[PDB]
Design a protein around this ligand. Structure first.
Ligand SMILES: CO[C@H]1O[C@H](C)[C@@H](NC(=O)[C@H](O)CCO)[C@H](O)[C@@H]1O[C@H]1O[C@H](C)[C@@H](NC(=O)[C@H](O)CCO)[C@H](O)[C@@H]1OC
Lengths: 210, 216
């Protein structure tokens, strides 16, 4: 029992229509799963958009809609607005329980796109004294708010000891992210090239150090 | 009309207990069916308990099954969640939702819960200095690595308020029991290092404050 998948990211412009579905590992999505659509707006605030597959909640606007699509729940937003940029989750009623999908990021283009400005940093004299080194890859200023971060030590792809923060909404409705690759100071002393590369929009920017 | 205010969360340690509370408003709290939903650090949403109308029926998912107990006091207009035998996976924001004829529509503000076994531990602050003189141009961006604190939060201020000038601080990360975080600042290239860029880092649990001056 239980898997509910949803698109991970969709991007649309203001005025356009977007559909978002909700798939089940169970097989088909009935009306006896009450497809529900929660909205997660800037800062942990949640709102019932649509419940029981097609009932739109009071206050929710005209464009939110519920449908069943090829055995799959779907949310339509017709003529989406800037305010709709947010995370949409779906819940499906499995007789007793509720099963939630991983919710989709929804960008609606409210301002001209822009790319990151990576700034890469080397472990300070001070942290090295504790026989541990950390490099900080700081990624700011991007819209849309999705990134892909890859680290390389001496050209080989790093497959661990790296962990990145989920984008976070700047003051200017621009996003920010940080990545950390941590090494024992030994390793630091050893390799000689560290690359931080961020892929945002087909374009990859890259910062390196020796 | 509706308000759902939950509360009763804090810092507990593994094996602990905890009763969460959620209070209704401007609605006839009895009639409606009801749930608890948790929002994890990973940011997935997971459901914890289900209560019916006359508290006749209770549903839970198998990872809470037997450790959590749901209930309500119609007299007081509240939902109760009773978390027992705590385990680190339960650290998450806990929310309450009313089923409006199967439309989960009104949700609480939420109540954060942390189940760590850590100990108040102040951070270590390290300078994040440019490195080779490779001047991109007008702008130079410095930062600070605040490492090994518990619990959160940590405020991070640049040049004792004086520098608001585009600061950016990031969601902390949890590296094997302690939190780490970064704050960065861009100050024009001809201001540093001629002028001074210190970084203030205060840790209220431990009532700490560290002053790392960033030098090339
Ligand atoms: C079955 O029809 C609704 O109620 C029955 C009892 C549900 N069956 C079970 O509860 C249970 O799984 C039996 C086997 O374990 C159905 O699942 C179904 O539930 C949805 O429909 C109603 C509208 C919801 N109740 C409410 O929405 C409101 O608070 C109305 C006030 O009475 C219910 O929680 C389900 O979806 C939200």
């Amino acid at each position: 029992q239980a898997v509910v998948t949803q698109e991970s990211a969709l991007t649309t412009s203001p005025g356009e229509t977007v559909t978002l579905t909700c798939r089940s590992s169970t097989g088909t999505v009935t009306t006896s799963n009450y497809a529900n659509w929660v909205q997660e707006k800037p800062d942990h605030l949640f709102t019932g958009l649509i419940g029981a597959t097609n009932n739109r909640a009071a206050g929710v606007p005209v464009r939110f809609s519920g449908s069943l699509i090829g055995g799959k729940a779907a949310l339509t937003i017709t003529g989406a607005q800037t305010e709709d940029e947010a995370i949409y989750f779906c819940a499906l009623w499995y007789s007793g329980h509720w099963v939630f999908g991983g919710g989709t990021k929804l960008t609606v283009l409210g301002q001209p796109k822009s790319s990151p400005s990576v700034t890469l940093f080397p472990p300070s004299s001070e942290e090295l004294e504790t026989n541990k080194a950390t490099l900080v890859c700081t990624i700011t200023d991007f819209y849309p708010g999705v990134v892909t971060v890859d680290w390389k030590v001496d050209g080989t792809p790093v497959t661990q000891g790296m962990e990145t923060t989920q984008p976070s909404k700047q003051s200017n409705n621009k996003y920010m992210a940080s990545s950390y690759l941590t090494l024992t100071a030994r390793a630091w002393e050893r390799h000689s090239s560290y690359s931080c590369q961020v892929t945002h929009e087909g374009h990859t920017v890259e910062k390196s150090l020796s | 009309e509706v308000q759902l205010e939950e509360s009763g969360g804090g810092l507990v340690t593994p094996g602990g207990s905890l009763r969460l509370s959620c209070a209704a408003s401007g609605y006839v709290f009895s009639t409606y069916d009801m749930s608890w939903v948790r929002q994890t650090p990973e940011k997935r949403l997971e459901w914890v308990a289900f209560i019916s109308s006359g508290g006749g029926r209770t549903s839970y998912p198998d990872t809470v099954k037997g450790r959590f107990t749901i209930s309500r006091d119609d007299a007081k207009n509240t939902l109760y969640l009773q978390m027992s035998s705590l385990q680190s996976e339960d650290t998450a924001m806990y929310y309450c939702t009313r089923h409006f004829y199967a439309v989960l529509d009104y949700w609480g503000r939420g109540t954060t819960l942390t189940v760590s076994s850590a100990k108040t531990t102040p951070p270590s602050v390290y300078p994040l200095a440019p490195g080779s003189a490779a001047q991109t141009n007008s702008m130079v961006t410095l930062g600070c690595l605040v490492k090994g604190y518990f619990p959160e939060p940590v405020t991070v201020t640049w040049n004792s308020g004086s520098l608001s000038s585009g600061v950016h601080t990031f969601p902390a990360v949890l590296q094997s029991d302690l939190y780490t975080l970064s704050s960065s600042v861009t100050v024009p290239s001809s201001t540093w290092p001629s002028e001074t860029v210190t970084c203030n880092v205060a840790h209220p649990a431990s009532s700490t404050k560290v002053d790392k001056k960033i030098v090339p």
